[PDB]
Structure formats: C-alpha cells, structure tokens
Write a protein that binds this ligand. Structure first.
Ligand SMILES: CN[C@@H]1[C@@H](O)[C@@H](O[C@@H]2[C@@H](O)[C@H](O[C@H]3O[C@H]([C@@H](C)O)[C@@H](O)[C@H](O)[C@H]3N)[C@@H](N)C[C@H]2N)OC[C@]1(C)O
Ligand SMILES: CN[C@@H]1[C@@H](O)[C@@H](O[C@@H]2[C@@H](O)[C@H](O[C@H]3O[C@H]([C@@H](C)O)[C@@H](O)[C@H](O)[C@H]3N)[C@@H](N)C[C@H]2N)OC[C@]1(C)O
Lengths: 260, 203, 178
RNA sequence: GAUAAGGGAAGUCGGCAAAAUAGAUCCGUAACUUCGGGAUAAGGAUUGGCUCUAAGGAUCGG
RNA sequence: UAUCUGGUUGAUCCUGCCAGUAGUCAUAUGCUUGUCUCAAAGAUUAAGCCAUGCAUGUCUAAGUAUAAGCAAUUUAUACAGUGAAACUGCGAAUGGCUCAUUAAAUCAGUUAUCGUUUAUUUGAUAGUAUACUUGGAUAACCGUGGUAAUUCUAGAGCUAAUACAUGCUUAAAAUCCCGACUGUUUGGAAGGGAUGUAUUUAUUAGAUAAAAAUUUGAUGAUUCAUAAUAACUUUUCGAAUCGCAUGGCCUUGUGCUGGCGAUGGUUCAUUCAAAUUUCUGCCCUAUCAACUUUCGAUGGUAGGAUAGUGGCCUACCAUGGUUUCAACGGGUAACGGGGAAUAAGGGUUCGAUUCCGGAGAGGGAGCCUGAGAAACGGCUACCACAUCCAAGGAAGGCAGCAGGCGCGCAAAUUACCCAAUCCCGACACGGGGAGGUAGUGACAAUAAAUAACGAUACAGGUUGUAAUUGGAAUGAGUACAAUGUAAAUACCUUAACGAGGAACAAUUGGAGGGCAAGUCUGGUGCCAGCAGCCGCGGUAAUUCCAGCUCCAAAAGCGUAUAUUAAAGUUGUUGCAGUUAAAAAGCUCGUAGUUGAACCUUGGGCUUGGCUGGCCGGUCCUGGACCCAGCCGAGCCUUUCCUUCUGGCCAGGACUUUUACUUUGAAAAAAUUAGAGUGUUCAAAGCAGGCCUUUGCUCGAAUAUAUUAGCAUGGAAUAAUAGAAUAGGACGUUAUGGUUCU
RNA sequence: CGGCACCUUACGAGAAAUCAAAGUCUUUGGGUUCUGGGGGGAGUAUGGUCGCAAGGCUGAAACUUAAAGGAAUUGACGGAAG
RNA sequence: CCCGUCGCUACUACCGAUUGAAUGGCUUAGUGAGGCCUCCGGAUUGGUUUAGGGAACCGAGAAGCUGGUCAAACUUGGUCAUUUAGAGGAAGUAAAAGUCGUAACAAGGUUUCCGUAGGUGAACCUGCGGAAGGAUCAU
RNA sequence: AACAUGUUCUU
C-alpha cells in the first residue's frame, strides 16, 4: 500500500478505549513511541474521554501546548502520545497524578495517585545482551534502555525506575511465588500470584497463576507483568477493586446491596 | 526493469500463472558489474533505504591475506586463471567472487624477509643466488637478531606456496564481491584447495 | 465512513392471510383496546414470541444455572415492573400463560380509559393524541406508551392542560366572547 | 541472350513466354485419409572469415 | 408455529409436478402519500466518454529578510516589530473512489525472519591521537526581451544559509609494531608509527560430564552478540547552526566562564511499517487425462543481482516435478473475508458496497525523487481518445466531490463550513469536497392524525343501540420570539392565527374455489374482456364491462424478476428405482468405500467432595454419627503408571506411530445472542444518576469463534510397530577386548 | 446340508395389484455399486470415440405444455366366453 | 377413443457452397519508441594550483556516440473463444370445426410389444429371435 | 366370407 498508514478508523481502534460508535469516522492514531499501537492509550483519550477535562480535541491541543500535561514526569505535547502500561501522568496545574493500570474489567481505569507516588514505575526485562564496547544493557517493555544493570538480571524481570534521572532503583527475580498482573489475553486487568511455569522449547511458555480468592488461571508467559515480591504487596497503588474478577450476578447483587 | 519476483514462473505443478499485479520496485534487479582489471573506476548505487553499494567496474589492486602467517597486504592483481562457474570469465579476466587469480607476490616477500630474515623462491640461478646472498648477509642488530631467533623454528613454509615465489605471482581466490562492495579482496591458496586448483589448471 | 446504525423490525405478519378464527380474534382485541390496526396486535405477538422463545429456552435449562437464573430473573423483573406480571408470579413459568390481552392493558389509551379520564376508549386515544394527558411530570403523546407500576399512580391531566389548568382553547376563545 | 522507373495480367482464347522459389541446419506444419499418407504442406530463422572451446577413438603395459 | 391448500377421475387411492402462501439490508415499477426519529442512494448495462469549478499544502520567539512593503522612534548605525516573494526543510506513498483483473492467486486463521529494509517516535549513545569561526555559487529583487499560446523561459547586475563544498579547536595514563645503540643467557633504551567509529577480507575469544598421579553474555539451536589480530577504502561522521534570558568569578581584559532550550548527528534498542514466509481451507466443468521440461520445468555446485532468502537470473551438470485423494485445461453474469436473507434440526442462497486485506487509476510498459511509489490530482514513450493553434507548436487523464453525455429496468445539488472526527506541515494560529451541515430522497426501519363527547323522540332487552341538536378539544399548516447551529434549516418550545359535508373529503387490491367478502340492477352475447391455477363468458354471467354493498391491509397497497421456507420435489440427518422416472445383458477387475473374534478381568482396604432425607440443630440456612447416591484419589492383589542426579521440584538419558474425545492459551471492532438505561415509548445509543453541590458516583457486562495450528487429560472404538534362518530382551556394582572424550 | 420351485398365512410391508421379501423402513443407520427427479423436444443436434458398414457408446440446449402416468372401483361397450 | 402422411399459418433450433464476416484473448517471426545501465565524448566551467609572456596538469561537466537491458507498440502468420449473414435442405412445436385412409384401445376384427433387416402415400407390412405388460397360472 | 367412418363447444 505504498507506505505507512496515518489514519485509524473508529471501528478499528482498540475497544479498550471505549470509543462511542457514532461520534465520527476516525479515531486518534497513537504516534510511534514507547508502547505498541494496540497496547497503549494515547493521551488525547486519557485527557478527554476519561477525565472530561476537555470538551474536544482542540482544547486538548490547547491544554498540552501550555506545558500542563506530563508523561513519566517529562513534558509531552504530542496529543497522540502512546501512553501505556505503568506510565505515570502528572498534572501539576490541577495538582493531580495518575498511573495507567489495567482495571480487572479489562481497561485503563482512571487511577489517581499521589505526588510522592507519581515519581517511579516498573519495567519488564525483554532481553539482556552486550552493546558496543562490551557494555551490558537490558531492554524494558516501554522502550527504555538502561546500561550497566545488575549482572544477575535476566528476561521476564521487573525493575523500578525513577522518572527523573532514568535510573533503576530496585528489581525482582522471576520465580514461583511472585505477585503479578496479566498483560494481555482474556485474563486482562486481573491480579494474581505465580503458581507454576511450564517451559515449551520452541513454543510459547505457559505460567499458572492464582488470585487471592482461590482460582487457578493459565496465561501466556508474554502477558505476565510482575508487580511485587510476595502476595499482598504491590509496588504501586491498585484501582478500586484490587484486580479480582466478579461474575455478573455477583456484581448485580452488589449493585442492589449498595443502592439499598 | 529486471525483476526478482517468483510470480512470472510456473507453479511446481507446472501451471502457467496469471498476472497478479504490475511490477513492484521492491523486487527489482540491476545489471551485473562485470568487473575488469584496469585503472580504478567505482560507481555508487543508491539502494533501498538510502543505503549505498559500489559497482567496481575496474580495479587495480586488492587486499589479500596469507592465512597461515596471519598477515595481509595490499597487493595488485595480475590476471584471472580459473573460474568455477564459467570459463568466459577467465577468458576475459572478469573478477567476481571465487575467481582464482594471480596477485603480485612481492609485498608478502618483503614481509617474509623483514619479519623473519630468511628468503623465498629457493631457485639457484644468478639473480636468485645474488638476492639470497644479500639477504643472508644483511645488517641486523643484536636485539633484532634475538627477536628473529624467537621467530625461528617455524620459518619454513609449505612447498607449494614458496615454489611459486620464483615467479613473483601467487595463486589466490577472490572472497569479496566487487559488484556489491567495490573491493576485490581475497586470500592466498593453501594446502588441499591449492592442490585441487593446481590439478585443475595444469591438467 | 461513519459506523452503521443498528435497526430492526417489531412485527411479523401471519403466514396465512385469511383465517376466520384468527381474524375474528384480532378484531376482538382491536375493539377491546381501541387499537389503530392489526400491526399493534402483531407487535404484541412478535415481542411476546421472542420473550417466549428465550424464556422457553431458559425453562428448558436447569435451575441454579447462571445463564438460566440470571436471564430468567432479568426477564421476570422486566415483566413484573411494567405490570404484565403481578407480585405472586415470579416463577418464569407463568410468563408462558401470558396473552396479548395482557400487554394491551398497560397502554396509556387503556389506562386513561380505566381511571375515569375519558368517556370512551376512543375518547382516551383522542385525548392522548391531542395532548391533554401527563404521566408524572412528563407529558406523553404516544398511545402505546407502556405504564409501569410507578407511573400508574402518576397519570393526570397536563399541568397546562385546558382540562388541567390553563387557557381553554381556540373554540372557547372564539365562542365564549360572543 | 540481357536489363529496366511507377504499376503488376489492365495484355491474351488462355499468365503463352519470362520472372519468382531452390542447397543445408533448426523451428513449425491444416483439411482430408484407404491410417500407409497428405508433407519439402503452409510458414519462419540461420549460413562468410578468423581465433578458440567441448564431445565422439585405437594399440600396448599388473 | 417442526402446519399446508387448489388442479389429472363418473367416483377412488397414488406418483408427480403446476398453482396458491410467507420472508428478503432485494431490486425495479404502478397507484397513492398528513406528522416525527433514523436512513441507503450511477455497484449490476459501459474499469464507457467527460465542459466547468474545487479536492495538498505548509512558519515558530529558536534555518535564510536592504520587499526601493507596512508601523513607530527604540535596552539596538550590523538587523531585531509585523509581514509579501524566494531559498531551505517537511508533507504530497495518507486519505477518498472503484471492483476491471485475479481460482492455491487474493483472502482467513495460524506461523517464520538463526532470511531482510525501515523517514519518523521514544530510550540510549562519540574527548581518538582561520578557530574570536573557511570559501564560492544561485534564487528572491531592479533591469532588456522573445513566443499566437502553457504553472515556457533567456541574456545582464547584485545578494544569504541548518542550501553546496571545505576544514581545526583536546584531555589523562596505557597497549602494540618497527627499532639505530646497549646491557650480556637475553634487559633497557633514543627515534618512527596505529589507537575512535564506519567499510571489506582473512584469521583467533566467544569454554562450563562429575576426583589422581583463572574472568566470560543470549538462544531450543548458530559461523549469535561482543571482543582481538593483520591489512583495506575515489574516507562515512566524532556540530563552522539558531532563539530568549543574561548570571557568577576576578589575575578588570568588549576577560575566564555558564540557564532553559531549537535544530542536527553515528550506532544500537524501541515504535510505526514493509517485504518475503509455514500449515490447512475456494464455485461450475472430463463434450478438459495427462501436464511441465526448446527459450527454467524439478534439483545440485559456483557466481551475478537484491534490502535480503530463493531458478530471481547466468554457467556447468543430473532427469527430475504434478496428477482419478481430479493435475493440467476451460467457465465464472468470481476481488477475498468480517458478514447478510431464510431459518425445528441438518441445510439453501447472497456478500460491488460503512471494518480488515488485495488490486487499479483509458490501455500497456519504463523510470525520477524519496525512508517508503514501479505513484498517475509525478515524469517518459507507444496505442486509443481528445483541447487549442497565427500550422511553427502547446497541453491532457473525474474508478476524488459536485455536475454533463451515453447506457440502460435501474440511482440525488455544479449548495454551506472547518464548529465535531481526525490527518498533514517549520505549525497553539495554515490547509483538508477526508470529514461535517443542508438539497433531492415512499431503498429499508421506529413512533404514529384522518376524530371525539353529550340530548330529543325515537328503537331495543341495567345499555348496545338507528338519525340530528349542541358545548367543547385538537394538530396538519401559517407566524410573533428564544433555542438549535460555524451561520442556518428542521425537531423540540411558543405570542397572534388555523374544522360540521370538521370539502383539512385514504389508498391499493379483491367479493366462484384455493381465500375474507354478494347469485343485487343494466350492458354485451364464446364477442369484448377476466383468469398465477382450476376456470368465467354462446341472451336470467355471484368471475367481463359498469352502479350499490361488503372484505383485507392501510400511509401504504399492488405488479415483475431473483432467491429462501413450503421441498422428505436433491434426501448426511432424510427420498425413490416390480408395475408411476429409474437395477448396467452378464461376469472379471484397479482406484475408492468397507471388512470376524481375541491380549487386566475380577476382588479387598483407606479416603476427599457434593446429593436426599435420619439426627434437625428451620431461619432460605448452619456441625461430628448412620444410611444410601453420584464425581473422584491412593494402596494391595504376579501388576502396569518412563529414568537418574541433587536429597515433593528441577537439571540430565532415553521415548512406535495415528485417528478420536476432554480441557485450556489465544483469537479486531462492527454484526449476532444477551445483563444495566422512561432516548417521554421504541428502533437505538452506551449512557446516566445523585438535596442540588463547585462535588460524588456504578458503567461501557457475558457467551457465541474453533475446520486448521498450539498446549493438555483419557486409553473405549478404529488403525500402526514388535522376538521366527532370532540379527531378540535383561545383566544394575557380570567378565574380557577395542576406540573416543 | 446345498438347489429349482410351490401352497397357506399376513405378524409385517405396500397406492394397490400384490410381496417370505417388495418384511426387520419417521421406533427412520450391517457393507457397497449403479440409476431417477412433471410431460414433451430427444436418446434429437453438436463435439469426441468404436465399427468395413449397418450402427454402438458418450450426449445437450432453444422452444413447448397442465398434466402425462400407476393401481384399483362402478358402469358402458366387445366382429370375447358361458 | 384415437394414429401418421398431406394442405394454411406462426415460432424455435439444426445442416449448408461462400478457403463467409465481425469482435475479444494468447502467440512464433519481423521491425521497434523510450527509460535505465554502460561506453566513449567534451559545448561549457572552476583551478589539483603554477608558470614572464602565462606553459603545463587538476577538478566539474551538457549535447551526442558504443554495447547491453527492460520492453510499449506495429505488421505478418498461427491458434483459441464468442457473436453473426447465407441460396438451399431437413426437423420440432403451436394453432374449434380442411384432405386421405383406420395403425392402436374389445381376440380392435391379422393378439400386442422389443431388437434387427428389408419394403411401402401415410399410419404401417413382412421375415428371424425374444416378452406377456395375453386372449392360457390348468388336462 | 366382408364390416371404413362419426364437425367444435358446453350446460
Ligand atoms: C418422405 N418421407 C417422409 C419423412 O420426410 C417425414 O416427413 C416429414 C414430416 O414428418 C413433417 O411433418 C411434421 O410437420 C407437419 C406439419 C403439418 O406441422 C406435421 O405433420 C407434424 O407436425 C410433423 N410430423 C413434414 N413437415 C416434412 C416431412 N418431410 O416422415 C414422413 C415420411 C413420409 O416418411
Ligand atoms: C392424429 N394425426 C394428425 C393428423 O390426423 C393430422 O390431423 C389434422 C390436424 O392437424 C388439423 O388441425 C390443425 O390444423 C388446423 C387448421 C390450420 O386446419 C388448426 O386449427 C389446428 O389447431 C391444428 N391442430 C385438423 N384440422 C384435421 C386433422 N386431421 O395432422 C397431423 C397428425 C398430427 O399426424
């Protein structure tokens, strides 16, 4: 087709953006950036369709042209910036902070956080190898590259990064017993804890997990995001629900119970 | 133009395929360089992605390696004496990869004499004996004499390689691709491969 | 372009056009509820029919089943709320007994007729059409407007009605002055 | 016994006479048929000189 | 709603079709047409031809300003503000249109790149062995012009950069090669070179089976990454750029210095892409049975070419590759898919077209530029069309939007606008016929007026009564005003208006049967006509032509064609073959389909859960005990159920192959089924609701997908293998011998 | 035991005539081959193929049409019988 | 009740001299635009930079030239497919009451029918073998 | 022994 597409049709936009059908023909097309097109949430969606801070995209343009909006602390003006998993969005003018986290229903809930909290994030180790001049580095899930990591770090490990200096604070080894959070699949948004991992050479590795309530659920290894060291201790704040799935009758019961 | 697509060919069953689309630029070919031996002329080619290739149309000199000795020098190419794929390239001295060529043996001779102190050729004529007597009676300081002694023992080389040093031209194989890189580089023939090509040549 | 808008039909004509029994029954229903045409009978038949297809399938399932319980209870509650079903009939098996005489009671034409607002059901229809009726604080002009239990109490003349407080109307304002 | 601009059988009873074709290699070859043919059907391409390359043998000697 | 009815006969039971019936987001057409919400719309024939206009441009404080352009005198006699032109940069490869080509092609799910390119984005990332900052070109501009004419340009004079080409500013110690002298059993040393990163070639690291007589990354896997050595290169680049603030230090020199930034740059990573690519899956056709291989067909070696693999192409060589399990050829009124219509189930039919993938821009081909195009709102050429011309020449591509011609059964305005949706650019600002708003719009879909209420004598067995007497009510429509909106329109809201024949007058088809509703009156007289079918009509026509009444659906009803059900009249479920159509004259026989039985059965012990009642302990529900029932485990019975190491997991050594079935990973939205929601209802949509806030709030469910691929439990059914000239199985720590590590 | 048949019955089958298979078929599945899909046009035309020929095998379409057909019943008729 | 030829008319399709015609695809051969690569060329131009008058030799380079490569397109021939004219010939079907006979249905007045072969205005007749769907389930 | 034929259309 002669070259790269620059438009995204509304019906072809990822469903986890909850874009209404009849608004118009097109959808925001997330720019090339740190996260994949499909597994990211562009800033215009975050700052318009979630927070209702803007009535439309022109006012989104105006808001970001005034250095208000920040991603991972740095200032961004790209209206279609592909904000993704673990990203921290700072709004100093409103005195408000956020972190993109998968709510259990499968989306990015509006997760408010504190200023002290809005200064770090987490990163899965894609690979570890030597660059030029023999210097070792590890690649994270957000396109960040860090040189001179701990000589023990391997793939599938989570690291803590400070959003100011880009430095690594502390990390996690991947093994049985780790609190995690599924990154894709049908088990999206739910928080579990590693039970077992089954290794298929040449294939796709399988990992067995368990929620706080006893539920064993398997998932592709590539969708496992370690979020802690043990059960009950995440390294970030969790949304209203703590990542446990509730059946439709359960939620209906709870809605009736709450409303009287 | 020239194309590399597979759609113009018959299926493995033997069916004649129908036209699918017009020719695409991402499947082009180009003209062979047909590199020759002469004064250097190198033309750049703009390729896909903004990269560059170099069509060696004519080359004088190439960087050749004596593999065993761990040394390589920028000699000059005399001619083409054998090509595995077509005798038309040897008959017209066309340089491509894997062409058997003769190079100037002179710079390797200088390196041999300077790094060791012995000489090659081994022929016992007039000029050969005169140069041998000159080399054996050269002026060497005591520390250079001792470092050359530390380089002794392994001084002698295989009988086929040094025998050819009588003519000042060795046998080599082109290892570079002159049409792709603009370099005409290679390595000296040695051992089993050398015996194979000599058997092919003298015949 | 822009995504299509979903739509559908709300009735299906009978396969046999001239059945004396069915025709007579449909005329009886039209007369008992003052309906405009048979399509209003057809709509009740259609919607009750899809209800009964889904609800029959549910009744063919087992109890305590989440599909079964969830969908059946949702259907039962949506039926009790509108006044099609009553208080003691939340079982999913009374719905099969339901009749086009049921769904046709809940119309604002019938309800306006039943509680003294009109002298005849034809009068009730022409009052709703001519905008003299009000359901709670919302004025309604659609005869097929279904009234739940909550709006059963809240049907009266329009707040600004000639029959509910306000300037009477053209014939009055043209005759009473002389 | 030869040649002839442009035309090309208008000449003549009639293409009479003349012209045109032609060896060899490779390609390709219809109807019809007594299945043998028709067939060199029809219709195309190549061919000099020089310098090379390859293939195809005989007799002795375990 | 898993349904039938009319028609062969004097009558019957059948076969069997014709006819009737209902749907179609399925098209045309006739008649008719009041209101609202929603809404398809030159696909079908001609990927036919097109007048005209528009559809792609782009500037920030941060590239280049002597407009002889505009404003005023100002922290600015180098400029400094605004702002044309032009240079430079970026975009123009997106979008939108269409469905012509195309049948293992496209496409779908599923793979691969240890087989490649990738502007941009985002991370990183280079001190490499004239410098108070180098040159020369041209545009813009004034000036002479030439041609009939075009977005044609020529001479001449200036003048710039983030344009073009050049070029230094520089650490620290250290390694290596050469090595004049020199120590003297093998040292030191002057003096020369290379130090980065790119490029090409060659050669070495890149190790990790456990005890006797040192450091080392990743992968399932590599010649991987990375590193070293020797050399190589028409030497890649390691910043001669720009804006605002102007600080601090004095050894007071237009001193040394240093804040946010613009832009740029090598390599790697990432992101957006691309190009190939594995496995399985396409409609009709044998009046297509052999096809491919000259000139590449199938494979091997070597090269060339490519971004890269590969007969992609060349040279030499071999003779291979596909096919009745349907190759190859032919047809397609064939772009594929998500999907659509009908639907008891199984099916049948359709999919040009709102999303995804492909392909094309009159037909063909070839290229430039660029990260990316074999680009057509880019070029070049031919063919076909076609415009102008002063006859010398010049200029084209609506299957973009609107509009014309043609074609036909068949489809709308040369309108308004960037306000939403998003896209592009140097960009907060410019542009966008993409897109949005109106016009035409009985394609379809939702809701839904054409009336109603009382009284007289009447009529009748407490109202259900046949007419004409009145009071009222109303929106169809016209119109003050606000709203709506970019401005409007329309809806919604509303001053003054707006009904007795409320003439503000409903239509389309029917009245023998199928099939609901007349044997009433005239006309004709087997004529004219009706009639889907059976039939009607020949002077008493319930069927024609007409008037009255009635029936059905109704703002919609009828006709034509196609398709779906009815059709168990295509039959796998599920037909028929003696005589209704239909068993080959008869055997043999290959492919195909299909093929007897048989190999661990019983028995016992211990024990988890959830089912009913007995305890009953009842607030629908709760605990140990007995009873039984179901789904399970573990041991023992001659005993299957891999095997070692560390020492119920985690690294080694081995595994007969399949079908079938279980479970799971994952599988775009839209559509389907389906939970929540007074869009006033509903179709829909994905919202909305709350004491009325300067806030708070549940949401945007769930299943369906699975032929093929992946992972997984089971061992019935159906296959496959095994020890028969023993060339068989075991010997753990059997014995001896020969090799390797 | 195998064979050519026959008689009765009708559980069963069938539209019936009839059928020991034409039964074990809506309570619809032992294996497998072939053939038909209203009546005509028509086993025609065309292409192919076999044959000395006569012909055999393969084999359409346009168009046309409301029946054609099967089995039985009552009558009538018979150059049928009693 | 019913068969065929024959007569009038209408419609459909078939054969057919015309080496008929037209349209669309594929293709041998011949010619071949143009681009790209290559090869020289050298209008012009700045100096690797140097010369008493400037003589060398550096760089940049247009038109054009050589040889290739991809290959539009034209002619010729071939082949495939699809429409289509045609003297004449031979069918089929339809169409109240035309002609000739009476083949079939009854033992249809010669039982009917199948295959094959001859003959004949027409139905049809005859020979050879077969069938009962016969007019005989039987001596 | 001979024996051919019966306009069309119904009610
Ligand atoms: C000379 N032999 C002839 C033979 O040719 C043929 O005759 C046909 C005849 O069948 C045809 O007859 C055809 O058409 C006629 C027409 C009146 O419609 C009808 O009889 C009928 O439809 C049909 N048979 C006729 N039209 C031509 C003859 N040669 O058959 C009869 C025959 C006597 O044997
Ligand atoms: C039964 N066999 C018949 C043979 O008898 C003959 O029949 C004709 C028939 O064709 C004639 O009839 C024909 O011709 C008339 C008119 C044009 O004359 C038409 O109206 C009629 O429809 C048509 N069938 C009829 N009038 C006399 C019969 N003998 O026609 C040939 C035939 C078919 O072979």
């Amino acid at each position: 087709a002669r070259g790269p597409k620059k438009h995204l049709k509304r019906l072809a936009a990822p469903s986890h953006w909850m874009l209404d059908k009849l608004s118009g023909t097109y959808a925001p097309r997330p720019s090339a950036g740190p996260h994949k097109l499909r597994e990211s949430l562009p800033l215009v969606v975050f700052l318009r369709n979630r927070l209702k801070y803007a009535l439309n995209g022109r006012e989104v343009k105006a808001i970001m042209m005034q250095q208000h909006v920040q991603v991972d602390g740095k200032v961004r003006t790209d209206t279609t910036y592909p904000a993704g998993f673990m990203d921290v969005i700072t709004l100093e003018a409103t005195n408000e902070h956020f972190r993109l986290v998968y709510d259990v229903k499968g989306k990015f809930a509006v997760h408010r956080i504190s200023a002290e909290e809005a200064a770090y994030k987490l990163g899965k180790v894609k690979k570890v190898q030597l660059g030029k001049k023999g210097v070792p580095y590890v690649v994270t899930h957000d396109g960040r590259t860090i040189r001179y990591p701990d000589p023990l770090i391997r793939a599938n490990d989570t690291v803590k990064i400070d959003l100011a200096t880009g430095k690594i604070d502390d990390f996690i080894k991947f093994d049985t017993g780790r609190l995690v959070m599924v990154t894709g699949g049908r088990n999206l948004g739910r928080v579990g804890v590693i039970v077992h991992r089954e290794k298929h050479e040449g294939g796709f590795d399988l990992v067995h997990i368990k929620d706080a309530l006893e539920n064993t659920f398997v998932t592709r290894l590539s969708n496992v995001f370690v979020i802690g060291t043990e059960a009950g201790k995440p390294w970030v704040s969790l949304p209203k629900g703590k990542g446990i799935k509730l059946s439709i009758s359960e939620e209906r019961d709870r809605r009736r119970a709450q409303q009287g | 133009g020239i194309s590399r697509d597979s759609r113009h060919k018959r299926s493995a069953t033997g069916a004649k395929r129908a036209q699918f689309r017009k020719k695409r630029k991402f499947e082009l070919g180009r003209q062979p360089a047909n590199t020759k031996i002469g004064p250097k002329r190198i033309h750049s080619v703009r390729t896909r992605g903004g990269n560059q290739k170099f069509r060696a149309l004519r080359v004088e000199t190439g960087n050749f390696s004596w593999g065993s000795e761990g040394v390589s020098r920028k000699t000059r190419i005399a001619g083409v004496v054998y090509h595995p794929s077509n005798n038309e390239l040897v008959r017209t001295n066309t340089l491509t990869k894997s062409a058997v060529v003769q190079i100037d043996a002179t710079p390797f001779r200088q390196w041999y004499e300077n790094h060791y102190g012995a000489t090659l050729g081994k022929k016992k004529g007039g000029a050969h004996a005169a140069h041998a007597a000159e080399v054996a009676d050269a002026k060497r300081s005591r520390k250079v004499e001792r470092k050359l002694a530390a380089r002794s023992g392994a001084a002698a080389i295989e009988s086929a390689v040094d025998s050819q040093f009588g003519s000042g031209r060795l046998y080599a194989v082109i290892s570079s691709r002159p049409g792709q890189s603009g370099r005409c580089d290679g390595y000296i023939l040695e051992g089993e491969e050398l015996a194979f090509y000599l058997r092919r040549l003298t015949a | 372009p822009r995504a299509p808008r979903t739509y559908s039909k709300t009735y299906s004509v009978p396969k046999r056009p001239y059945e004396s029994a069915r025709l007579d029954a449909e005329l009886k229903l039209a007369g008992e509820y003052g309906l405009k045409n048979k399509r209003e009978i057809y709509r009740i038949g259609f919607q009750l029919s899809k209800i009964r297809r889904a609800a029959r399938d549910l009744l063919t399932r087992d109890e305590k089943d989440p599909k079964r319980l969830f969908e059946g209870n949702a259907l039962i509650r949506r039926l009790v709320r509108i006044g099609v079903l009553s208080e003691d009939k939340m079982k999913l098996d009374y719905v099969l007994a339901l009749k086009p005489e049921d769904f046709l009671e809940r119309r604002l034409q019938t309800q306006v007729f039943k509680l003294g607002l009109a002298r005849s059901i034809h009068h009730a229809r022409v009052l709703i059409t001519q905008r003299h009726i009000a359901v709670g604080k919302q004025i309604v002009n659609i005869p097929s407007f279904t009234v739940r239990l909550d709006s059963q109490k809240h049907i009266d003349f329009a707040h600004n009605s000639p029959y509910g407080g306000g300037r009477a109307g053209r014939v009055k304002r043209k005759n009473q002055g002389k």
